[PDB]
Write a protein that binds this ligand. Structure first.
Ligand code: 9LT
Length: 113
């Protein structure tokens, strides 16, 4: 129960804050199926920050939980696909950790609305 415009402004800011934690920009765009041809065999719902931005502007995030769930998919897809001894896997762990405080603070701002 709140106004749409300030909520979307908050989500845009939050998405930027999350992307700032991905310094190598490895989560910025869809995993390229031309370089990773078997990716969809194991990952049923790919996600990345560009797709999240598209979803945001298409009004697909009208609650904080749905936004946070797509962020969690970026992380969990990467943990699932990649071996534990890779930079990718460790980057997903780090993103999960650093994203946590970002999301907790942003959710508090949504609740304030
Ligand atoms: C973390 C999400 N992620 C995975 O989780 C995963 O398993 N494989 C991934 C593979 C790529 C990937 O191929 N990057 C290349 C690349 C290499 C160097 C710079 C640059 F900008 C892009 C590339 N893109 C298109 C063509 N080329 C070669 C990206 C993410 C991936």
């Amino acid at each position: 129960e709140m106004q749409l415009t300030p909520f979307l402004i908050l989500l845009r800011k939050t998405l930027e804050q999350l992307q700032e934690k991905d310094t190598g920009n490895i989560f910025s765009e869809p995993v390229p199926l031309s370089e990773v041809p078997d990716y969809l065999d194991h990952i049923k719902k790919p996600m990345d920050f560009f797709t999240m931005k598209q979803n945001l502007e298409a009004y697909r995030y009208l609650n904080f939980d749905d936004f946070e769930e797509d962020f969690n998919l970026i992380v969990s897809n990467c943990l699932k696909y990649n071996a534990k001894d890779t930079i990718f896997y460790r980057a997903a762990v780090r993103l999960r950790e650093q994203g946590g405080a970002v999301l907790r603070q942003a959710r508090r701002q949504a609740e304030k609305m």
